[PDB]
Design a binder for this molecule. Sequence first.
Ligand SMILES: [Zn+2]
Length: 678
Amino acid sequence: NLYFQTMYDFEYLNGLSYTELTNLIKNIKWNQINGLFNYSTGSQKFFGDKNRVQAIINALQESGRTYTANDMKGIETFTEVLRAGFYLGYYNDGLSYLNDRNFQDKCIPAMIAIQKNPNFKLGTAVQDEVITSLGKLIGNASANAEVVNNCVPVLKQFRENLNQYAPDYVKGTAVNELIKGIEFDFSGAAYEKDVKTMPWYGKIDPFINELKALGLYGNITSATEWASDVGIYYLSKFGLYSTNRNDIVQSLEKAVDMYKYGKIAFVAMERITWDYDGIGSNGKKVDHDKFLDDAEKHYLPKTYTFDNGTFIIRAGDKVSEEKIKRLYWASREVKSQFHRVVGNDKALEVGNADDVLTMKIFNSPEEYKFNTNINGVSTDNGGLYIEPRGTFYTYERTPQQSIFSLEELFRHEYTHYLQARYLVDGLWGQGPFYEKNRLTWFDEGTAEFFAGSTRTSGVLPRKLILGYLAKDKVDHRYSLKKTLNSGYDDSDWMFYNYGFAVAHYLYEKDMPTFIKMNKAILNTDVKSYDEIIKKLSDDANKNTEYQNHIQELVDKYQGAGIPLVSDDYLKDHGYKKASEVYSEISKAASLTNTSVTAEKSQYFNTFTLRGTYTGETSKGEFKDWDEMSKKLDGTLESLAKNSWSGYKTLTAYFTNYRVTSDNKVQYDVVFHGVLTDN
Ligand SMILES: [Zn+2]
């Protein structure tokens, strides 16, 4: 169509002679051809002239024959043009002839020429790019056993310089693209056919052996591990085209043993399971689950059992016993504050997995990654609680690996365990309160909030979250409306920090609403919850209140702290007669109709004392809550003035607010602490 111009349209290229065209292609870059990968009338007529594409194929072959270490003879730009051809032909009827294997094979003479060149080696940028381009072309075109086995020298060269070459992006990419391209083509052709019917079947043993050597290199480092990963993955794939099935499975099994509980061993097992029907070289079925089970025992060998086996920590061998204890005692501080605010400590459902809380704490982030392999959950996080398993997965960490210590993070995630067991009825995230966007701010916001639980001072803000709140006031602070009604669509990284601010704002400045809101969720009453959220969002004064609270929180940053369990918990408390502890607590807290259970843990025993507290005439539910909190914290503080160090392990909460027939405040009250009497 066109006969005048440095970007080039198909209408112009279509008008050139094949010799003027091929020459032009040879000394431009692929991106200079407009709409190369787009299907048009112009690209239709460019490809679809079988003579012109065969002209391009021929030019490529001549480049393969003549390229040097410093000059690529336009092999990249040629390969991309052909790739565009086979790509458009796969997707667009009218260029259907390009999708035909018999036509794709017309590139093999070009490929063989490229490989016969003395410069077909890893080395300089040109030589590497040729190998890269070749692999990408094979993925869209074709290969046969001859071209595949001609890659064996490259794979040898790479292997022989693995520590120099495997880390290099360019050389690593070259080899990866070569293997990946060939496999894509072969699996494409072998798709849904008897694999013994393929030409290359049995003819690629030299290539397969090069993958073997790569996969079983053994002396891998963090930098080179992917290379041997590649080796094993593709050993399995290409080994489908070997006559000795058991020989391949045997090498995959050696990978498993050689690499045991590193990445490559998981890959090797996957290959045996998927590519070889999970049947070992000895012909017997491989115990995949035992391997996973062994992997977990390796990574999490230590078990620490608390509360008659209802709080179990499985941990890496380097996670501190001291830490383990601190986490137990943290759990109790958060639990208690949560029950105070919610007013229920009876599990909503009978028989759920969370009847036992299991925590799995890997030694490190590195080792944490294997938890996706082992337990099938994401490890792109600092931790995760899976409610239907009643299991929290996380890992020990230094300050460099995370801003959050293990205790801080657990304190947050433990609240999710509390929400599912004690607050939100039904299955986690799959009830009325999730049929619309309702609890997104709440679930995360209150978790950040309850993480700041203390023993005797209620819930306190956490310095790090206040740190986040020191960011652009300018336009950036969420309004109350935005925080309450914002979801996964409308939000950025500060969402949960403003959700915490709403939680805290309500806690400190509007407890009546916080209690109402919590009751609404507890009672499974979406109507009332929605009304509270609408009232809050519609009242501009409440937003002015809230905007101020945000500044107040920000002002508290300088002097703020990380609520963390005291060292007092870890001291040697010494003996005290049980009935004396129960009497002093019962008297001090004015409890009636008390009962106690004792529970055995790894390093100590505990007790849980339950009673009824009937006070003076009610001053209203919310003022009652305020005063009961000060009375109960006062009781905890005065008990810790006693000589027995064990009184410093106490946590307490109250539930089931009611008024009596004579208007007297009433609660169920619960204390928990260490027990040092047989
Ligand atoms: Zn969370």
